[PDB]
Curated annotation (Swiss-Prot), chain A:
Protein name: Non-structural protein 7
Subunit architecture: Interacts with nsp8 and nsp12 to form the replication-transcription complex (RTC): nsp12, nsp7, two subunits of nsp8, and up to two subunits of nsp13. Eight copies of nsp7 and eight copies of nsp8 assemble to form a heterohexadecamer dsRNA-encircling ring structure.
Organism lineage: Viruses, Riboviria, Orthornavirae, Pisuviricota, Pisoniviricetes
Signal peptide: none
Highest taxon in the source lineage: Viruses
Function: Plays a role in viral RNA synthesis. Forms a hexadecamer with nsp8 (8 subunits of each) that may participate in viral replication by acting as a primase. Alternatively, may synthesize substantially longer products than oligonucleotide primers.
Swiss-Prot record, chain D:
Name of the protein in question: Viral protein genome-linked nsp9
Source organism per UniProt: Severe acute respiratory syndrome coronavirus 2 (2019-nCoV)
Domain Nsp9 ssRNA-binding residues, every copy: 1-113
Parent-protein residues present: 4141 to 4253 of 7096
Superkingdom as given in the UniProt entry: Viruses
Function in brief: Forms a primer, NSP9-pU, which is utilized by the polymerase for the initiation of RNA chains. Interacts with ribosome signal recognition particle RNA (SRP). Together with NSP8, suppress protein integration into the cell membrane, thereby disrupting host immune defenses.
Subunit record text: Is a dimer. Interacts with NSP12. Interacts with host SND1.
Subcellular location: Host cytoplasm, Host perinuclear region; Host cytoplasm; Host endoplasmic reticulum
Length: 72, 796, 93, 113, 50
């Protein structure tokens, strides 16, 4: 579970970097901090909260289609 | 009882409070610098012939002033009284009071030194050089009794650390003026001894922290005006404290007083040769070794190191804008150019290029490469940079906007991870869990990691100790062979690697190893033997998997520096990485039983073996420039025939101007590298290896010297310690016999396995328990006083 | 080369340290500021003094390389700006 | 207890002069040191007022080194033979510790006021 | 994950965050509710479930 959430944080920051999030210095710095703290986290509660915070960045943009990517 | 107190209070300061038990002595654990025909070294002893009476201020307030009255034999009493009467007129002498006081049935002579501090200069030097956070009470008392800090400062954890809480530098700097006053009083005392015809050896334990001198029980009298104060051990042991406390901080003032504005040196002024000589005469007047402010004039590499140690101290006074490349306007095709025709090193002094063309017709390839690698043109053609993110001296901004480089997150391997979790991996509570990741970094990460060079401080090394550690390290680097190799004999792995700045704009190292013929490369390499080529080192963010979120940075050294350093060092480096069973295990494979061979060679002949590895915190960032220069000189010890003394010195100057104090190109702008290892140079691993061996040898030397030689049961180790002190602070030339003996002793009892700052030592445990070998605390103390870091024992 | 020759010809032998050429003869100064607390100390107002010279700001940008006006550098408006602020100034006379 | 120099040494008999081979047969009191790397002369002591160069051969015989001397030091020593007014000379570049050893030996083997 | 699933479903159908959602109990959150269905499903009185 903890390894799962860390790997999801890795892939989420990968897709954020692919979406030119690094063009926003504040947003990219916050994303980097969240991603590095998830990987350094020891419990699956703080890590999951930071994962929600990081995913909010992806959900905050219109560059990714959320309905299409949810094929289940 | 009360009569003895009144006798001590002779004609001044009647308000004394007995620290002992009346007319009895006061046993203290002080640090001395003894050398008397049986026992030698610099260790903490137990003084048992000393009565201390601390003066009190008005209204019964204790003050830092003690009347240290000691009883001694009649002959020593009268001898000390006579020599003091010869030296009493000197202001830098403790007020001695001589009297015979009847104790039981005889008038036992007494000597009352007046207005002494609780701890001597040796106590401060020992506390700063043999530091131990587990028990450092003398250092705390010294810091609190001189308003350096409060007792509440020590309640803060890591108050002593340099990487954590850099304010300890400011705390130690408050001892700087006191140490400088002690230096001035030492110079005055040496002048008094010379004029009065008193011959003796100055030691830190004979000078209190105010600066006044005492203990004349070992001085001898000669004809007045011909006296000689033997001060090598004193100054040598004080040298690490001088830069740690920044003792010469007052010299950057109008009247050398800490109440005036900083002396506004001429911006164009870079020489400072006269200022360095004036500083040396003011603080090291009787240092009986010729000091060359410019290291071009030094005799050999040992003299280069000796004078660079003084230059380190003296460069803390001069403005940082006066160091770096020395540039002048030259004309090519009649068009003016701004190129570096010299360099002003903080350690090597002023160095001028010998093949300098103020006018030229055209430059074909070699001068074009030199001027392209030269930071002179880029800095002159760039915008002035004031980067407040870092304390490092910014130079210029080459582009109109700052480049913020980020580190991408790692690319996931979902297939492998799913296969692993399919095989029962990464279970909740499994002993194996993912701890290594490609940690991402934001825009202001390259500059943030470059600011870690703030941990590189100007460090003055114990020169009489460093000159022996260098000989021991050279004995370590003896089985190898090295020297100059031609351009056709140079092996370059991965020619498609980046070539520094600005050569990365046009191609990799393959272009510059293909565009330059063997004669072109040989001409460029011979140019560096009589010229200095400052180079731009590009700071590159490392994109690799690690267990630490801190950004990793590697130094991209220019092809001009790397190509010449290859021709200068690669023979020795290949010899080092071709030797098996040696202390340095670079080039020794861990495969095919090579790891077993390495470990068996580590367990060579240790009688009571333990394994001990340590850590250098911020090794490439906090390594003193003196130790990097020592590393380059040890690597240059193989050039006895291929290079002249001028050639070796100019190669060292190129090393210092390219990989030690070069212009770093972090982001898109130039900065000044204060020092440390530019861990991207052609000798990174091997220079770090010789640095590691030097640190280990220094720790062993400090363990031997900071050991009670009376309590050393073995008669061979005791004599080894005595001769170690002799070869450090008494012998001036290399004692190759004792250098070999100490090298063999280290190999037998402190066998090492050295890579680039990673080391494993199989040490004699029963010797390190007895202080005959550095266990871990000597390493911690050596890092504290000679690396400007606190080596945490949890990393060892 | 005007100020460059002014400082080169003023040298003892035409040789000067490199660290002073941008500090004396550079027509443009770039200041990188990590926070507003360092901004108010260094680059206060539309003109400021540094390196024994007077510099007048012509452009301020953030790490995003977006032009940010001087009115936006406020105590309350600081968290709304990317913060390595890069202020570029010109030499005054 | 930092002693100056325990178990010091004595002086040898050698020839010296004021310029190169100005030594007729013998005029000096050379102070030697039996260093492990070879015999080392430390100081000169002559009745003549001024000396500049001395010729003390090494143990090899073929190699004779001409030693440059420091400006003379003048003093009076009270010996059992009455006043012995010698002039002290130090070889240029001598260490301060060697000077201390030489002075200690001179003051221990010769009576002083 | 319940929180991740909630925010993902909201972004799929209804409200998306207008900024990084905080985890401290002092900072604020801005969302974009596009119709009454998500407004009723998420908001109830003075409380907003997200
Ligand atoms: Mn003493
Ligand atoms: Mn004594
Ligand atoms: Zn060579």
């Amino acid at each position: 579970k903890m390894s799962d959430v860390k790997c999801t944080s890795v892939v989420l920051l990968s897709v954020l970097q692919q979406l030119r999030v690094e063009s926003s210095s504040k947003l990219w710095a916050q994303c980097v901090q969240l991603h590095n703290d998830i990987l350094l986290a020891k419990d699956t509660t703080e890590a999951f909260e930071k994962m929600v915070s990081l995913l909010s960045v992806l959900l905050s943009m219109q560059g990714a289609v959320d309905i299409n990517k949810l094929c289940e | 009882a009360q009569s003895f107190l009144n006798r001590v209070c002779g004609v001044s300061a009647a308000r004394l409070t007995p620290c002992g038990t009346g007319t009895s002595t006061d046993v203290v654990y002080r640090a001395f610098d003894i050398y008397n025909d049986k026992v030698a070294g610099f260790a903490k002893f137990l003084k048992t012939n000393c009565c201390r009476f601390q003066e009190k201020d008005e209204d019964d307030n204790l003050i830092d002033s003690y009347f240290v009255v000691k009883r001694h034999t009649f002959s020593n009493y009268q001898h000390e009284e006579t020599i003091y009467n010869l030296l009493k007129d000197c202001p830098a002498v403790a007020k001695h009071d001589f009297f015979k006081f009847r104790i039981d049935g005889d008038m036992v002579p007494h000597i009352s030194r007046q207005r002494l501090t609780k701890y001597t200069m040796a106590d401060l030097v020992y506390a700063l050089r043999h530091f131990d956070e587990g028990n450092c009470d003398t250092l705390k008392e010294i810091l609190v009794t001189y308003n350096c800090c409060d007792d509440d400062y020590f309640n803060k954890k890591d108050w002593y650390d340099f990487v954590e809480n850099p304010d300890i530098l400011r705390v130690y700097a408050n001892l700087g003026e006191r140490v400088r006053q002690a230096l001035l009083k030492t110079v005055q005392f040496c002048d008094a001894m010379r004029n009065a015809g008193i011959v003796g050896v100055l030691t830190l334990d004979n000078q209190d922290l105010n600066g006044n001198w005492y203990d004349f029980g070992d001085f001898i009298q000669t004809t007045p005006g011909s006296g000689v104060p033997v001060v090598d051990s004193y100054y040598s042991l004080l040298m690490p404290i001088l830069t740690l406390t920044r003792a010469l901080t007052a010299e950057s003032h109008v009247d050398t007083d800490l109440t005036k504005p900083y002396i506004k040196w001429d911006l164009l002024k870079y020489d400072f040769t006269e200022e360095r000589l004036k500083l040396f005469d003011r603080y090291f007047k009787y240092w009986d070794q010729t000091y060359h402010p410019n290291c071009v004039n030094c005799l050999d590499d040992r003299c280069i190191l000796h004078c660079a140690n003084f230059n380190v101290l003296f460069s803390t006074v001069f403005p940082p804008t006066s160091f770096g490349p020395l540039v002048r306007k030259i004309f090519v095709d009649g068009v003016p150019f701004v190129v570096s025709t010299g360099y002003h090193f903080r350690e090597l002094g002023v160095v001028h290029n010998q093949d300098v063309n103020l006018h030229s017709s055209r430059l074909s390839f070699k001068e074009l490469l030199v001027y392209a690698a030269d930071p002179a043109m880029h800095a002159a053609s760039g915008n002035l940079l004031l980067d407040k993110r870092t304390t490092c001296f910014s130079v210029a901004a080459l582009t109109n906007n700052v480049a913020f480089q980020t580190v991408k997150p790692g690319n996931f391997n979902k297939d492998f991870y799913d296969f692993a979790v399919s095989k029962g991996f990464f279970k909740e509570g499994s002993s194996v869990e993912l701890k290594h990741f490609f940690f991402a970094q934001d825009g202001n990460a390259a500059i943030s990691d470059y600011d870690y060079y703030r941990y590189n401080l100007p460090t003055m090394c114990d020169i009489r100790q460093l000159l022996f550690v260098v000989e021991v390290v050279d004995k370590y680097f003896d089985c190898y062979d090295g020297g100059c190799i031609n351009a056709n004999q140079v092996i370059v792995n991965n020619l498609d690697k980046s070539a520094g700045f600005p050569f990365n704009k046009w191609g990799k190292a393959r272009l510059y190893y293909d565009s330059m013929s063997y004669e072109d490369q040989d001409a460029l390499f011979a140019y560096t033997k009589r010229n200095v080529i400052p180079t731009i080192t590009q700071m590159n963010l490392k994109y690799a998997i690690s267990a630490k979120n801190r950004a990793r940075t590697v130094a991209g050294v220019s092809i001009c520096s790397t190509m010449t350093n290859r021709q200068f060092h690669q023979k020795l480096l290949k010899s080092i990485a071709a030797t098996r069973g040696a202390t340095v295990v670079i080039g020794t494979s861990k495969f095919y039983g090579g790891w077993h061979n390495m470990l068996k060679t580590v367990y060579s002949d240790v009688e009571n073996p333990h394994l001990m590895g340590w850590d250098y915190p911020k090794c490439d960032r906090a390594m003193p420039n003196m130790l990097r220069i020592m590393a380059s000189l040890v690597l240059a010890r193989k050039h006895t025939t291929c290079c002249s003394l001028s050639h070796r010195f100019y190669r060292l100057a190129n090393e210092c101007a390219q990989v030690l104090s070069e212009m770093v190109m972090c982001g898109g702008s130039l900065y000044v590298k204060p020092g440390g290892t530019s861990s991207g140079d052609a000798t990174t691993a091997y220079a770090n290896s010789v640095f590691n061996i030097c640190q280990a040898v220094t720790a062993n030397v400090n363990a031997l010297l900071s050991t009670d030689g009376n309590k050393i049961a073995d008669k061979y180790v005791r004599n080894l310690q005595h001769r170690l002190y002799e070869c450090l602070y008494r012998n001036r030339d290399v004692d190759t016999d004792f250098v070999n003996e100490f090298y063999a002793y280290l190999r037998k009892h402190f066998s090492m396995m050295i890579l680039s700052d990673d080391a494993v030592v199989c040490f004699n445990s029963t010797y390190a328990s007895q202080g005959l070998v550095a266990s871990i605390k000597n390493f911690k103390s050596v890092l504290y006083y000679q690396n400007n870091v606190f080596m945490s024992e949890a990393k060892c | 080369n005007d100020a460059l020759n002014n400082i080169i010809n003023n040298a003892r032998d035409g040789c000067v340290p490199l660290n002073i050429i941008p500090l004396t003869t550079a027509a443009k100064l770039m200041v990188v500021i990590p926070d507003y607390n360092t901004y108010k100390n260094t680059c206060d107002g539309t003109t400021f003094t540094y390196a024994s010279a007077l510099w007048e700001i012509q452009q301020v940008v953030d790490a995003d390389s977006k032009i940010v006006q001087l009115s936006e550098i406020s105590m309350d408006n600081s968290p709304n700006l990317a913060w390595p602020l890069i202020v570029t100034a010109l030499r005054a006379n | 207890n930092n002693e100056l120099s325990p178990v010091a040494l004595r002086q040898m008999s050698c020839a010296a002069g004021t310029t190169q081979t100005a030594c007729t047969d013998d005029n000096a009191l050379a102070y030697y040191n039996t260093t492990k790397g070879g015999r080392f002369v430390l100081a000169l002591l002559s009745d003549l007022q001024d000396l500049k160069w001395a010729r003390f051969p090494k143990s090899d015989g073929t190699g004779t080194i001409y030693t440059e001397l420091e400006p003379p030091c003048r003093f009076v020593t009270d010996t059992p033979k009455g006043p012995k007014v010698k002039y002290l000379y130090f070889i240029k570049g001598l260490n301060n510790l060697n000077r201390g050893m030489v002075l200690g030996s001179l003051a221990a083997t010769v009576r002083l006021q």
